[PDB]
Amino acid sequence: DADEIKRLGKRFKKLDLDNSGSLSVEEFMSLPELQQNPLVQRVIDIFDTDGNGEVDFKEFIEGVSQFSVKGDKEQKLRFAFRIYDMDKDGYISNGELFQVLKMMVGNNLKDTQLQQIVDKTIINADKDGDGRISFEEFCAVVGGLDIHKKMVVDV
Amino acid sequence: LSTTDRVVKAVPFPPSHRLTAKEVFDNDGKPRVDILKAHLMKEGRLEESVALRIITEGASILRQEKNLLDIDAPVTVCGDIHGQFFDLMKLFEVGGSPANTRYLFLGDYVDRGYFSIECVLYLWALKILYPKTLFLLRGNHECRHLTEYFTFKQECKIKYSERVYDACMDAFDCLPLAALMNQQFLCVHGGLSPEINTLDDIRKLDRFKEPPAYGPMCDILWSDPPENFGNQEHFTHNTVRGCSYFYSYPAVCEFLQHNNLLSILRAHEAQDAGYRMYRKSQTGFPSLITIFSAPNYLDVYNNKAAVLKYENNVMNIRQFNCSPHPYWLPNFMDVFTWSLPFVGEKVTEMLVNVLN
Ligand SMILES: [Ca+2]
Ligand SMILES: [Ca+2]
Ligand SMILES: [Ca+2]
Ligand SMILES: [Ca+2]
């Protein structure tokens, strides 16, 4: 849509403070309400599909495209799935499950409690014995919660 | 720090292996309760078939007992446990090994303690192994209404299965209601009832069912003395519980005289000292004594527990404090169910602010 292309052009240009054509973490952090958000670097890293530390226009477009009103349930739940899967192999493993819980909870849990509940969730939810959570197990667990209704954004 | 190896190495990792029937039951079928106690103390689990065998054998034993057991002194009488397995362990430390100590429990094994299934499994193993020296009564929380209202069902579904829950409910239906101790004392969870005038009224009840929301089984499990007990109506509506009744001092004295009893013993309400002696009967002997064995009730009360060891014509109250236990999040929620709403909330907030 024309107004959408125009708005994405204007926002890209406004965020690219040094006019380098790519958005760095520092450039996002120039926004005051982002300076105290502890998950900025994780979202940027997820956007950075080529791992160069910045978000180019292609990455920006593909990222925004997953939040369109026309996107289906699977697209949203797969974005949420990709939030945990830092290494992008399609499975939540012990190490990355620990890392992601530690990023999200900070000091809200002690290391002992968090490690214990990570262990217990892995044990109770792993059904094929590979120590990680496949997409099938994920939908078996969360498919009935109707969380897809809240992950909607108006562009 | 490693992302795979365990952070707190001084904590031993609990065993995952499920014990088999040959490892837990000897050639004659008796539970090997020292191994089982060590394993459960390690948060170890059983094979499903072994849990079901223990539960159904214990249910069958309770099922074959009378409503009112005939139990000679000496005996140690114990009140509410409420899933405090490590406090049950302390209780057995204070009262003495079941190998040579008679025990009576007054109920509330389940409902808000986070080791209810471990309590059930251990007590059922002791009851199978010690059928005439360890005794378990039914409390008012031992029912479907409350276990579906409270957290016991979630605990069963997290650690075992809903089938294990149903097995627990059928075993609980078998729990005796009362004990006759040294042919002198009636021991119950709650107290007296308008519909019980003779011991035969207790013997004639049908107990093999979920406790109703009202009626004699409900009042037996739920009634309390008034908070102002001892300081003219025999039975008054119990406004604290929302069911059953308060009974008065004349009511108690009449019951004692008509049934040739010395005193009544019940539980269910926390007390700062672990016990309360109310107004004495018209001899110097207290007409009523309450004993309460659930320490730090609801994890916040900070109260002591006590048990009553009746032996050599001495009633020795032994109190004990609560003991540490491992942590569970409320209602046994797993970390995905717990954290995903917060993840979605904070990621959505971030995206909305970055974009708008
Ligand atoms: Ca830059
Ligand atoms: Ca990087
Ligand atoms: Ca790895
Ligand atoms: Ca693993």
From Swiss-Prot, chain A:
Binding site for Ca(2+) 3: D85, D87, D89, Y91, E96
InterPro entries named among the record's database cross-references: EF-hand-dom_pair (IPR011992), EF_Hand_1_Ca_BS (IPR018247), EF_hand_dom (IPR002048)
Residue sites binding Ca(2+) 1 per the record: D16, D18, S20, S22, E27
Keyword Signal: no
Listed CDD domains: EFh
Alphabetical list of Pfam families matching this protein: EF-hand_7
Chain residue ranges for the region called Calcineurin A binding: 116-121
Membrane topology label: Lipid-anchor
This protein's UniProt keywords: Calcium, Cell membrane, Cytoplasm, Lipoprotein, Membrane, Metal-binding, Myristate, Phosphoprotein, Repeat
Keyword Signal: no
Domain of life: Eukaryota
GO cellular component, one term: nucleoplasm
Residues at which Ca(2+) 2 binds: D48, D50, N52, E54, E59
Residue positions where Phosphotyrosine is found in the record: Y91
Record's subcellular location: Cytoplasm, Cytosol; Cell membrane; Cell membrane, Sarcolemma
UniProt: Ca(2+) 4 binding residues: D126, D128, D130, R132, E137
GO MF terms, alphabetically ordered: calcium ion binding; calcium-dependent protein serine/threonine phosphatase activity; calcium-dependent protein serine/threonine phosphatase regulator activity; calmodulin binding; phosphatase binding; protein domain specific binding
An annotated GO BP: positive regulation of calcineurin-NFAT signaling cascade
EF-hand domain segment(s): 3-31, 35-70, 72-107, 113-148
Site (Interaction with PxVP motif in substrates of the catalytic subunit): M103, N107
Recorded family membership: Belongs to the calcineurin regulatory subunit family.
Role, per record: Regulatory subunit of calcineurin, a calcium-dependent, calmodulin stimulated protein phosphatase. Confers calcium sensitivity.
Note: This protein has four functional calcium-binding sites. Although African swine fever virus infects pigs and not humans, human PPP3R1 and PPP3CA have been used for the crystallization. PPP3CA and PPP3R1 interact with African swine fever virus Mal-047/A238L (via PKIIIT and FLCVK motifs); the interaction does not block catalytic activity per se but inhibits PPP3CA function by blocking the access to the two substrate recognition.
Summary of subunit composition and partner proteins: Forms a complex composed of a calmodulin-dependent catalytic subunit (also known as calcineurin A) and a regulatory Ca(2+)-binding subunit (also known as calcineurin B). There are three catalytic subunits, each encoded by a separate gene (PPP3CA, PPP3CB, and PPP3CC) and two regulatory subunits which are also encoded by separate genes (PPP3R1 and PPP3R2). Interacts with catalytic subunit PPP3CA/calcineurin A. Interacts with catalytic subunit PPP3CB/calcineurin A. Interacts with CIB1 (via C-terminal region); the interaction increases upon cardiomyocyte hypertrophy. Interacts with RCAN1.
Protein name per the record: Calcineurin subunit B type 1
Lineage: Eukaryota, Metazoa, Chordata, Craniata, Vertebrata
Gene coding for it: PPP3R1
From Swiss-Prot, chain B:
Annotated catalysed reactions: O-phospho-L-seryl-[protein] + H2O = L-seryl-[protein] + phosphate; O-phospho-L-threonyl-[protein] + H2O = L-threonyl-[protein] + phosphate
Region of interest: Calcineurin B binding: 327-355
Keyword Chaperone: no
Tissue expression from the record: Expressed in keratinocytes (at protein level). Expressed in lymphoblasts (at protein level).
GO cellular component terms given for this protein: calcineurin complex; cytoplasm; cytosol; dendritic spine; extrinsic component of plasma membrane; glutamatergic synapse; mitochondrion; nucleoplasm
Means of activity regulation: Activated by Ca(2+)-bound calmodulin following an increase in intracellular Ca(2+). At low Ca(2+) concentrations, the catalytic subunit (also known as calcineurin A) is inactive and is bound to the regulatory subunit (also known as calcineurin B) in which only two high-affinity binding sites are occupied by Ca(2+).
This enzyme's EC code(s): 3.1.3.16
Effect of Y275 to N/A: Loss of Ca(2+)-mediated transcription factor NFAT activation
Annotated segments matching region Interaction with PxIxIF motif in substrate: 313-322
Cofactor note: Binds 1 Fe(3+) ion per subunit. Binds 1 zinc ion per subunit.
GO molecular function list: ATPase binding; calcium ion binding; calmodulin binding; calmodulin-dependent protein phosphatase activity; enzyme binding; protein dimerization activity; protein serine/threonine phosphatase activity
GO BP term, example: skeletal muscle tissue regeneration
Membrane-topology descriptor: Peripheral membrane protein
Motif (SAPNY motif): 293-297
Catalytic center residues: H141
Localization: Cytoplasm; Cell membrane; Cell membrane, Sarcolemma; Cytoplasm, Myofibril, Sarcomere, Z line
Region described as Catalytic: 46-326
Residue numbers marked as site, Interaction with PxVP motif in substrate: W338
Implicated disorder: Epileptic encephalopathy, infantile or early childhood, 1: A form of epileptic encephalopathy, a heterogeneous group of severe childhood onset epilepsies characterized by refractory seizures, neurodevelopmental impairment, and poor prognosis. Development is normal prior to seizure onset, after which cognitive and motor delays become apparent. IECEE1 is an autosomal dominant condition with onset of seizures between the first weeks and first years of life.
Family per similarity comment: Belongs to the PPP phosphatase family. PP-2B subfamily.
Entry comment, domain topic: The autoinhibitory domain prevents access to the catalytic site. The autoinhibitory segment prevents access to the substrate binding site.
Subunit structure: Forms a complex composed of a calmodulin-dependent catalytic subunit (also known as calcineurin A) and a regulatory Ca(2+)-binding subunit (also known as calcineurin B). There are three catalytic subunits, each encoded by a separate gene (PPP3CA, PPP3CB, and PPP3CC) and two regulatory subunits which are also encoded by separate genes (PPP3R1 and PPP3R2). In response to an increase in Ca(2+) intracellular levels, forms a complex composed of PPP3CA/calcineurin A, calcineurin B and calmodulin. Interacts (via calcineurin B binding domain) with regulatory subunit PPP3R1/calcineurin B.
Record's protein name: Protein phosphatase 3 catalytic subunit alpha
